[PDB]
Design an enzyme around this catalytic site. Sequence first.
Site, short mmCIF file in Angstrom:
data_model
loop_
_atom_site.label_atom_id
_atom_site.label_comp_id
_atom_site.label_asym_id
_atom_site.label_seq_id
_atom_site.Cartn_x
_atom_site.Cartn_y
_atom_site.Cartn_z
N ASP D 62 0.83 -1.19 0.00
CA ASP D 62 0.00 0.00 0.00
C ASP D 62 0.87 1.25 0.00
OD1 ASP D 62 -2.30 1.44 -0.12
OD2 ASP D 62 -2.93 1.07 1.95
N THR D 95 -4.13 3.61 -2.94
CA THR D 95 -3.21 4.71 -2.69
C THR D 95 -2.22 4.83 -3.83
OG1 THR D 95 -1.91 3.18 -1.35
CG2 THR D 95 -3.41 4.65 -0.19
N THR D 96 -1.67 3.68 -4.25
CA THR D 96 -0.80 3.65 -5.41
C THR D 96 -1.49 4.23 -6.63
OG1 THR D 96 -1.54 1.41 -5.94
CG2 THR D 96 0.34 1.63 -4.47
N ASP D 393 -7.33 -3.12 6.16
CA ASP D 393 -7.90 -2.57 4.93
C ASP D 393 -9.18 -3.30 4.55
OD1 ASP D 393 -5.60 -1.05 5.02
OD2 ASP D 393 -5.16 -1.29 2.88
#
Lengths: 521, 60, 50, 527
Positions: D62, D95-96, D393
């Site tokens: 992440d 997020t990437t 997550d």
Amino acid sequence: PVNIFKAGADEERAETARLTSFIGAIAIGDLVKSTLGPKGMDKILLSSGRDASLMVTNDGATILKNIGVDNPAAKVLVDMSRVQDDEVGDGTTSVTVLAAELLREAESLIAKKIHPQTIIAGWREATKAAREALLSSAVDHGSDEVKFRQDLMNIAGTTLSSKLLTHHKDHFTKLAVEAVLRLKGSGNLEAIHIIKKLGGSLADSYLDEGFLLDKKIGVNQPKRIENAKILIANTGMDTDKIKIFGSRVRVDSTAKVAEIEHAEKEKMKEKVERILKHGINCFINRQLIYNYPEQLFGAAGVMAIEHADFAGVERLALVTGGEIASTFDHPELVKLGSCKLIEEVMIGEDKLIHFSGVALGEACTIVLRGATQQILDEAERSLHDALCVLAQTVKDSRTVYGGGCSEMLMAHAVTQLANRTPGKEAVAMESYAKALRMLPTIIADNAGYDSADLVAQLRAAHSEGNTTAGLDMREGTIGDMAILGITESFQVKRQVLLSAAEAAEVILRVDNIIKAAPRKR
Amino acid sequence: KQGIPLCALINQHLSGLARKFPDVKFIKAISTTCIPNYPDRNLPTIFVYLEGDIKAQFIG
Amino acid sequence: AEKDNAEIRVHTVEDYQAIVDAEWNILYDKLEKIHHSGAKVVLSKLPIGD
Amino acid sequence: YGRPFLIIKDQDRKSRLMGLEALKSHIMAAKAVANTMRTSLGPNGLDKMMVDKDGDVTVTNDGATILSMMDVDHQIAKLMVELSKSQDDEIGDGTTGVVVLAGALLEEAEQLLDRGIHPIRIADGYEQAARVAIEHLDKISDSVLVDIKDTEPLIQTAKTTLGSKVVNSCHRQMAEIAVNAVLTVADMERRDVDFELIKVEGKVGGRLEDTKLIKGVIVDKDFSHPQMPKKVEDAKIAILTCPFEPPKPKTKHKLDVTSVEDYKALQKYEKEKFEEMIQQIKETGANLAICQWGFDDEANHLLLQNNLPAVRWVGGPEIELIAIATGGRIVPRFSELTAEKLGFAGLVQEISFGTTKDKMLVIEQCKNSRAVTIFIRGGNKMIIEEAKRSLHDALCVIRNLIRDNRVVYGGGAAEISCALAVSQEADKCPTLEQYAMRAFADALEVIPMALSENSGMNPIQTMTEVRARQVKEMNPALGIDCLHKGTNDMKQQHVIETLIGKKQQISLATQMVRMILKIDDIRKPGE
């Protein structure tokens, strides 16, 4: 195109990162590959800032414990060895060298511009098939006492080959067996006691028929007792402070103070008589005691033992049939420890108190009268590993075959799977299978035999279907361990392979090593 | 942990110090009830605190 | 403590027990006043004991 | 000037940059950071393993955990660390994707600003494009099936969410465990839950399959004074926050002693206090005792020979959740001890782990709890960390999808649909503004190309052909076959994730691109 890191912060986002990781991994692998098989030779961890502290070890656990590195992959493998040693014992060597070979495979594969996810999926499937095959070959025992005992003897004898103590294997392996017999099926590990006393020989060592204590006795305690009624206590007995505070002595004359002193002496005598009302011939105190309680006990004339150890008192409560007490209003609701004789023994140049004919023998005490401190330390490490293996094989009765037997079994199964598998994965798995083939190979390398000849013969034997085929390490031939007696723990090898699989999974899925700027030192 | 002449003499010295510096907060207790199962081979350990920051240490 | 300077001078264990239970009674009487007051929430700068 | 001077103290010790070229500088880093993360997209992603300043190894996939403990020197670097941390704060993985998208917008901005276009108009165009795209995307998105009896749609959603990290190794039991846990812990009446109602504890040793869900209590202590039996059947428990000892008041207390009679009074007082404590507890009808702040060994043996198991020295919130699960009550002190508030447990046991000294107390209550706990048995500290991050997550995602009509099919396809929408929007728009929307769409197409590059196959032509397919086909949600399993339709490849995640990612990336575009001056020290 612009600097973004702090002074000392590095990022390698090319194949140079995997190159560095791989060379560090190989540096790990070769250092330990000399500590495998019955032909291993030991190593030295020499210090210069630790005030010249050295330790000699064979099980690479301590080796990876005492060496750090900047390349994070090597530390990852060090933690992997940590885990492996946390599970059972020896095999850290095995799993680490196996990881080295698999990463060398990965090197060879990346040498062909292949997306690694194919390798990942293929190795997933190969591991699934191999674990299924090994479970289908899981040989189990324990339905007979003699069979199970001989299986334990075979496992212990095979395991002592990987360490030094093989020189007196018959005087060691069998002995260790009885120790786990004394566990009486309890899962505790912390009942066996480890004792190091330099001087004498490893064959001069023995397993006593009882227990020993290494604490000072009170001022006036008898040297020997018979049929000891034993009690264990943990209270003050140090002028037994009232535990109440915010209370003060505030008088105007010292006669009252004298009466208070006389009263506290009387109260302590009252505590002593409270204890003596139960009636014992041997007393145990986990901690210290004061002169006045000692005089009272000498008046009683019983054995008072002072400043014991928490783990040791737990062990001895398990052993002698008593439990620790802290209040003594109940001469009726306590079980008393029991022993036949409690005498004095002088071992090395240190004084011990001997429990002979204990009512029970749950815990264990292994005295090592070795010849050097370093050999003593490695001997205690090795016996710890061996007793862990013994406990694990008592836990799960299923066993497997070593000498590569199970290893070439899974190798051939993966071979057939790759043959019936299309795509790169097959040869990858084949190379993966070839990877596994390196493990027994290195073993023969430790022996220094005709390597390729032996590997070819084993592959031919396993293709023929001879599922008990193995390597004879006594002469360099190929035989059946069922005759020879080379058996190992199913749990051990199973978890070795699974942990190696997941370690390879995590290591191969790396793309960019970024070392943060060092704080200072 | 009371009982050893080490800890007893240290307690004596600090109590006598209290007679000289009544502007310093002294704290004494049994570490077992302060820290659970605290190693009894690590006493007496002097702690110097202010605002939750250790400034000086004198361990064992 | 009451005003950080209060001192207690008693002579027997019964007095000691009476005083400590009395401190508890002060606490629980404040609690009773709060509860019987009818409010459902309380807020303050000052810490609330467990 | 005729004579030198200084208006700024250390004026020659601080630098000053300005102009559009100054923007270039930021955009410079806008490559590397984005180019840093572009390598990890996809369920077959290639994780990153790195060291902090102290000498610790961390592996993950992440964005936020990467960016935080990455040493960042440039100030845009720290801004983007904040950005990915906020994205994790809301959703998790992706997020990437946010970093990649915002970056790609930045490079296309540098490419197109060279034409000499007003940055304010660029921001306006990006804002219009983003609002139109989000409107269309929320319009198109379909409804998800959430139930307390049917979980398979949510199982597939969770499984897709595991299609970014290592946890896809098992990838089946994980989804079931996550959905069951979030269903159990969830507050029904408000469509909410709080994760502090959940405990995660990871222990070394074991295999990934050993991961399990316990709707009970996991405690890491053992039987206090352990020379008692190491387990017991159904137990009735009372919960105390006070030790077992004659208490001392908060006020400076001085008990005057002047008689040996007061000495015997103190002795009687302590003994009767201990015995009355025992009488109180054993009388109210319990079997198990728990002490927050420990107590003395005298009370230990009193509890032992009374054959009443007990534990001590437990953390605060641990005890709080224990009482929650058992349904009983924490009695502050012996006066308020009652039999009504005692707790009951289906089973309690001590785990020995074969060889390790550590013991944990597993507790299955007789009654269910609105709190559930997670226990892990693995073979690496780093993999334990990664598994814990993935589980957190997953719970966040399941809470996100607890809302109905919030599902959509991703897989690099919804970006295509919004790209078509914004292309049309630019078409129904005059020039001098539509270049911004063109850049918006070109940035939208970025993520699928990165996805296919992470597949090691031909990215560009596959992407163009799949776009042509989605235009020609009746399926507006058909993505990319990234695991050699056949078709391109998402409805049967099941790349299922929550719509709010994508809306949040898009809006957040738009805002940070605005933020970067708005600034042009830096005054910094160099000594």
